[PDB]
Design a protein around this ligand. Sequence first.
Ligand SMILES: Nc1ncnc2c1ncn2[C@@H]1O[C@H](COP(=O)(O)OP(=O)(O)O)[C@@H](O)[C@H]1O
Ligand SMILES: [Mg+2]
Lengths: 28, 557
Amino acid sequence: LATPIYETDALIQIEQSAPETALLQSRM
Amino acid sequence: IDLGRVIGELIDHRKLIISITSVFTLFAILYALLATPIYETDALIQIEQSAPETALLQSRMILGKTIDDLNLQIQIEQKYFPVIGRGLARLMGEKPGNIDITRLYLPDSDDISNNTPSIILTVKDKENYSINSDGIQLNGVVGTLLNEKGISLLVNEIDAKPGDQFVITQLPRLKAISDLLKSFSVADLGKDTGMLTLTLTGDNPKRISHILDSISQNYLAQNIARQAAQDAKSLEFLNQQLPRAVYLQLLNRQQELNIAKSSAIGNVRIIDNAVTDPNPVRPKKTIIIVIGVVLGLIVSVVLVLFQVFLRRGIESPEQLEEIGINVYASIPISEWDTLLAVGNPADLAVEAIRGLRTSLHFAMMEAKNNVLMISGASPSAGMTFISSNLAATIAITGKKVLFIDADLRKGYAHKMFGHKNDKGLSEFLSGQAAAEMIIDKVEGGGFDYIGRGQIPPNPAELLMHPRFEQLLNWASQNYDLIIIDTPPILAVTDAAIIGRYAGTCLLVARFEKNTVKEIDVSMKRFEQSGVVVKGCILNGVVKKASSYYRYGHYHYG
Ligand SMILES: Nc1ncnc2c1ncn2[C@@H]1O[C@H](COP(=O)(O)OP(=O)(O)O)[C@@H](O)[C@H]1O
Ligand SMILES: [Mg+2]
């Protein structure tokens, strides 16, 4: 009876990568 | 130890356990529902390092600039007399009031301790208000500014109901800076990223967001002034060096320094302006309540275990029978100045006493005479209760019974039987009475008794008189059974004097009060005086779930 939970994903390339995680989860 | 015993102990002390745990949980509920909620706001700053920027953000210059901008040195508190008035007022949904103050100056008493001047403002309407410093009452009105007695004040936009009181403090600038600092936090969250998370906690959900925005703005505007400055120093130098190809060269360089000055956006960027999480971060109600309940349970269990290991009273006849003492009966509490065996002949205690009667009818054969002496170890163990009721039950079977109250110190049998208090046992023993004026009839009984009479000054020495043995020898020919009630044996020695003439002697042990040690000492003290104790009678039993010793103390009929 529990509602099923689907998952979606995407792949991004950074031409680093430590601050971009915080940018993505930002409120802007 | 085993599991059954501990389960029984918890079942028996359930009342105490529930009471203590409920009290602890009630205090936890009260605290979690009356503590002032604390909200938290945050913002995100991007750094184009990051170790010195943390220290520069928490510097006194930037925080001081923020405080000066937003007047954080004017502290306003809604007044509630108790340490719970604010919380309760919140609980009824009452909206707290707020006042905008834009100018304040107190006389600055500044004694040894109270460096913080304060006043109390009582709101009288939407417009006017009363002000008191130390009883100095003044009237002010919104709008017009006030300068009286060395107090300058300006209030705008009173938003409250009349009658409210507000404490207004003018705390020193450094105190305000420290207060702001202790609630302000900065973190890196990446240890290398240009990401700084700024956090500020406070009781007002909007004021904290305004403060954090002001801090971010001040820090940012400060940072660009640094980069603009070094360009401005270069621009100023080139202008001061102006004296034609070089003339054009410096002008082009000057314009490059002009554009570099105006394009301020630099090392610091505000990603997220501050917003406030609407759910307060403190107090954390669920964890408070869980800790309260768990603490109640732990303290209750420790208290119960403490009481169990410090309990020493008798609990079952097995304890007495280990030592080698015959227990002839076990009398329970009768929850019901009258003889129980007459008022309520069908009580459980009277049933147990009938069991004792049938035990005696077999024990007292081959006794040297028909005299029974009931005694005990400690006072108020039940000797008079047992003796009197036993006499009643033996009397209802058609046998002549004589009850003697040989407790010449605190005997009250005459009160409990209905009395002619003259000519008790004392008057006979001292020689100023005969054997016939002392014997009296119980009304609701069926047996005779002899009361003590007047309290003598020499009880133990009276009982040694041979007239006592004369009385016993005479009565032993006119009655089927003689019961003698005596004082305790640990207190005085009367019982051991009397027991010389008694064919049978029994002790009464009170259920939880006495211990096995007293009973053993009492038996040995009786033996040393040449009195052989037949056995013991456990009295005052109650139901214990932990017992696993289980009686016939239940109604059958
Ligand atoms: N099993 C019992 N049930 C109800 N009351 C009792 C019981 N045992 C003793 N008592 C009452 O408690 C009081 C103390 O007993 P009491 O015999 O008078 O003291 P003592 O043994 O020192 O002479 C008395 O009022 C008695 O009626
Ligand atoms: Mg007594």
